Amino acid sequence: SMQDPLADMLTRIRNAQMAEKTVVSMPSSKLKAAVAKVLKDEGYIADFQISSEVKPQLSIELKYFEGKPVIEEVKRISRPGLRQYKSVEQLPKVRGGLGVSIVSTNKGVMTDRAARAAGVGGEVLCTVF
Amino acid sequence: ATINQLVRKPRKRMVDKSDVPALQNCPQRRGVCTRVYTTTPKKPNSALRKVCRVRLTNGFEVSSYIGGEGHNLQEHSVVLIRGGRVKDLPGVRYHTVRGSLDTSGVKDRKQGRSKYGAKRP
RNA sequence: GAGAAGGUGCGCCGGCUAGGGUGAAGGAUUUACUCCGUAAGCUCUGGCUGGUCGAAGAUACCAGGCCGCUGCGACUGUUU
RNA sequence: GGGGGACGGUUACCACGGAGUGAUUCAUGACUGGGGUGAAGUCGUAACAAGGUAGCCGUAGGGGAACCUGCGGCUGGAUC
RNA sequence: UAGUUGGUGGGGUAAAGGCCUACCAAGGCGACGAUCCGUAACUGGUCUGAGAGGAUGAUCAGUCACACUGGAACUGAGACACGGUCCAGACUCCUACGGGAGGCAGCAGUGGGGAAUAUUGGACAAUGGGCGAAAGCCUGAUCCAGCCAUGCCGCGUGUGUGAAGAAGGUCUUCGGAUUGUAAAGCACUUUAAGUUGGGAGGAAGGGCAGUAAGUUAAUACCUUGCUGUUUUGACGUUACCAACAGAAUAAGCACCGGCUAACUUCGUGCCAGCAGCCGCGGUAAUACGAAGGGUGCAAGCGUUAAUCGGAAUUACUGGGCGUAAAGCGCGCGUAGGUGGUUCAGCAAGUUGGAUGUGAAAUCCCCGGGCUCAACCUGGGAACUGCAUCCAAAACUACUGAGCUAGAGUACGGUAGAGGGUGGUGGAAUUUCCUGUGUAGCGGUGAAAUGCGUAGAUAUAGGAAGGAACACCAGUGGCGAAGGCGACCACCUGGACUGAUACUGACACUGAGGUGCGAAAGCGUGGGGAGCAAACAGGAUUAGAUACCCUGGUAGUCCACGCCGUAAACGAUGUCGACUAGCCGUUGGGAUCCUUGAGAUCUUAGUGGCGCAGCUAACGCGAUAAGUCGACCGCCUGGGGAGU
Ligand SMILES: [Mg+2]
Ligand SMILES: [Mg+2]
Ligand SMILES: [Mg+2]
Ligand SMILES: [Mg+2]
Ligand SMILES: [Mg+2]
Ligand SMILES: [Mg+2]
Ligand SMILES: [Mg+2]
Ligand SMILES: [Mg+2]
Ligand SMILES: [Mg+2]
Ligand SMILES: [Mg+2]
Ligand SMILES: [Mg+2]
Ligand SMILES: [Mg+2]
């Protein structure tokens, strides 16, 4: 009985970049398949595939610019039981604008740089460096 | 502790109390004296400290301390006590202002005269 | 323990207002030492409001004094 | 003269005061139970090394006092 | 909690209502904390803080509540009325003894309390109120003075030159060093304070006269423009300006061992004394008392009292629980918290916007006035809020439909000290009976108490009785935990493993509440082999209640009921998901050449090492203390005290 799916996608990513894996495969959803699209366009993974029929999977390939990986830390903000909501003024900035922060707004899941341009607040998900 | 416990029982900040329990929220206090002992300090010192016991206008019967180098304090004479915790003696929690009402300060003193109440030559 | 302690109400005269019980005029019908069931009467309970008389309304005979500490015997009982 | 009004009368409501029985809170009390401290003093040497009977935890019984023995558990147990 | 909670009928009040009354009905509130106890006027704001917050409600402003104590109404637009009325009480005073009088929580003032808080001022000129509008009259609210280093801000206490480096002081290696260009000496300067002269602004009006407009029937009156003339200031010796005198009129306070800027001599010798903590003082003290010197601040400096910081030391932002304090003894489960996956709807959360509001002051920003500043003041932002509308639809909620990965059922199949109720064994111990046999047995560092010819120990035969269950037996099993080992029957719970169908999220955790709880102990009844607290004797011992020895009772055993704690231990809450390896072992399927002492792989347990990683360290390391989620319990210095 797992209570939160999206803090389990991020846990497998953080663990596989210490076993120096390349491909990671977890079950999918219509939210996890949209978060990995955002991490690809910002650029942290190689690609992703939704390839099955009744238990649809998510196969993510990871990057290594060095022996050190490209993602160095990631934490879940709106843990189920806290539900962090932010307007555009109080919306956070990670590392002076060098990390990414993923905010579920009225116009779809987009990063903090996009919704602040459109002026739409919403709900934070994570703070990836 | 999780958030859903602190909603049910919030964090209650613990409180202190006054190290000077008598003279309730006031800087000085007068009292008449009863006895002038001369007690001995604790172990690592060796001396003979001079201690008077005062009955205030609150009705409390607390011991006090007398500084300086020589006191004219015969019994049934009013004083004016103030706080101050002497580490050496046990049970002593109050000093005594010199030169205020009856204690009349010290004599032949030329360093720090506003303490102990001495004039200017 | 305990009706602990302690307190209020109570007489006559009307005005209203709840009943209760017998009952039978009749019907049910098993037709007869039978089932139901009225009116009027008698009868026993009550309620809530007015008036009124006296120093005095359980007006007489009738009938708990109460409480606080302690010794001894568990108790009702029995004995010169 | 009526009407109406006042003043008296009387009932309702009500403060002070008076009564009984309780709670609760401070103030104080002959004598008692522990605790903390101190520096003298006496009786021992329980614990720390296998502290000279391995210690501790629960529980019962005993004893000037540390404590001892019984039953069960524990290694936070050292020699091999 | 019984006008208590509703209903009905009637009253009552400016106005809805148990506001009140008569009957009807038996409701209402409460663990989201009612009721009760203890304290306290709330708010805009002030004080700290980077912020989140934390304390606190002096002066200024808004609201409430009182006017010696307890009641009560009248009058009236509006009081249940601070200088009104009636009553009762308490307390002062008057009196011819019959009776009366009074209420500074208005401004001053006295007494008292206390560590502690001001003059029995000046006026109506200003702004305002009340009455009359006809001027005027009242005003201890206002506007002004007096007192107090009670606070913030500003200015003085002179400036330059001057080394014989003077005396004088202190220290010294006796040479000097230092106080120090500091003085003295010389040349200038005069703000403030003192003195003299001058001198605004706060003044708008009112009176009187004249004139022009509109009112009218009558520019008679009156109202209004305007003109002319006359009069007004408590402050007040006003701010401000000019002149004169002359360097004259004017500096303390704490500290100097470390935190902490700044040091050496002289007294004193465990004395006196010092202290915010560390701690100094027993004869050389950079800590006590002095003297020089020096550092900090200044018209002030120090101590005490009291809040917030530092304190991530109540941790929302921002901590912890293997051994430092801290995981309930273990389950099941109500309220509550959280929710796998596809569509569709909806718009309660959420985001964006608009409007109404959030008093003025205060804080902040840009300006403007007082010679500057404090102070005064114009414009903006802000006041994080709450409400009403409009739109968006990702996520959560709600609603409608599905899907099978969680979870559960049906079917084969194994393994087990998992429970409960009876039954039956064999070895050994003891008591008893009987034979043989005859001097010690038993015990201990060594002995003694004890048991023995009244025939013991030994030895053989027999009987009775009680409890425990060698070997197998193992880091081995099972149970939720405590616990559970003879064999068989009897009922009876759950786990594993395989195949296959079905239900279609039916799940997780759990304050309160419900259960099962080692051993010792307690109650009634059984039963009494051994062992054995209490106890008795011997020995050891300065002493020995103790260890050791010989005895020995409750108890241990069974049935029924109770108690509820343990180092109840993995000193580690339950549940779910990912993360290098290697060697073992229980049970179960696989695949596999087949003879295997087979092989490899996979789940469910149970052990030994180990890389990343974490950790104060030790050490854990797919059975985490690693990386992350959901809910719960608990910790806040040591004693006092789990009392
Ligand atoms: Mg008797
Ligand atoms: Mg007789
Ligand atoms: Mg802070
Ligand atoms: Mg006064
Ligand atoms: Mg003028
Ligand atoms: Mg001068
Ligand atoms: Mg000194
Ligand atoms: Mg804090
Ligand atoms: Mg549960
Ligand atoms: Mg405002
Ligand atoms: Mg155990
Ligand atoms: Mg524990």
Side-chain angles (χ1 to χ4, degrees):
Chain A
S1 174
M2 60 184 293
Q3 302 292 112
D4 190 80
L6 196 141
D8 189 72
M9 183 187 75
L10 297 175
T11 307
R12 298 188 185 188
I13 293 167
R14 195 189 302 116
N15 291 320
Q17 290 182 356
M18 294 300 170
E20 294 293 327
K21 303 296 289 183
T22 302
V23 290
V24 185
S25 68
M26 74 288 290
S28 175
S29 65
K30 70 178 182 289
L31 182 58
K32 295 176 182 179
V35 172
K37 187 186 265 79
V38 177
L39 291 177
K40 185 183 75 174
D41 295 334
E42 297 293 326
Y44 293 102
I45 62 170
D47 274 325
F48 68 103
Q49 290 84 20
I50 303 168
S51 297
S52 177
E53 62 278 18
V54 294
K55 299 178 181 65
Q57 300 298 105
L58 183 61
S59 298
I60 295 173
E61 185 178 3
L62 301 171
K63 291 172 68 176
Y64 299 106
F65 175 69
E66 295 293 323
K68 277 78 66 178
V70 181
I71 293 170
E72 293 85 3
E73 74 272 15
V74 47
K75 64 176 285 187
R76 176 69 179 273
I77 297 300
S78 177
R79 45 184 292 271
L82 189 62
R83 299 296 186 186
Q84 193 66 256
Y85 293 104
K86 290 295 195 289
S87 69
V88 179
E89 293 291 328
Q90 292 295 321
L91 194 64
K93 177 188 282 188
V94 288
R95 306 296 181 89
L98 299 174
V100 292
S101 297
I102 301 171
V103 178
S104 302
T105 66
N106 300 323
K107 301 173 184 178
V109 173
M110 64 185 71
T111 179
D112 51 355
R113 299 173 180 181
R116 184 176 291 167
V120 178
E123 177 179 359
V124 185
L125 292 176
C126 64
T127 64
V128 182
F129 177 72
Chain B
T2 57
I3 308 299
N4 205 4
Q5 299 182 1
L6 297 174
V7 173
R8 194 185 301 121
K9 44 175 184 176
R11 289 182 180 270
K12 186 70 175 176
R13 178 251 183 83
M14 68 290 197
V15 298
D16 284 332
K17 66 181 290 183
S18 297
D19 53 355
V20 178
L23 53 91
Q24 48 271 9
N25 197 356
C26 63
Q28 280 74 238
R29 181 66 63 186
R30 76 162 60 91
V32 68
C33 60
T34 297
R35 179 62 62 193
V36 183
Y37 301 106
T38 51
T39 185
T40 67
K42 288 184 187 294
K43 185 175 176 66
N45 287 323
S46 292
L48 187 65
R49 295 280 180 262
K50 290 183 285 188
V51 167
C52 68
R53 178 174 288 273
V54 178
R55 186 182 63 84
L56 297 178
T57 61
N58 296 318
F60 293 165
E61 186 74 25
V62 291
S63 296
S64 294
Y65 185 76
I66 301 169
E69 288 85 5
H71 66 285
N72 55 4
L73 192 67
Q74 188 265 328
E75 294 86 4
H76 296 279
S77 298
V78 295
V79 295
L80 188 69
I81 75 168
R82 66 175 173 85
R85 180 69 173 84
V86 174
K87 187 180 182 295
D88 199 2
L89 301 170
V92 172
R93 290 186 177 96
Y94 304 104
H95 288 85
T96 294
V97 180
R98 305 298 297 271
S100 182
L101 269 295
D102 188 76
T103 54
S104 297
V106 296
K107 59 186 70 64
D108 191 76
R109 180 166 176 84
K110 292 181 181 181
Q111 289 178 353
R113 296 94 42 85
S114 67
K115 300 179 182 180
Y116 309 106
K119 298 300 290 181
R120 186 178 62 181

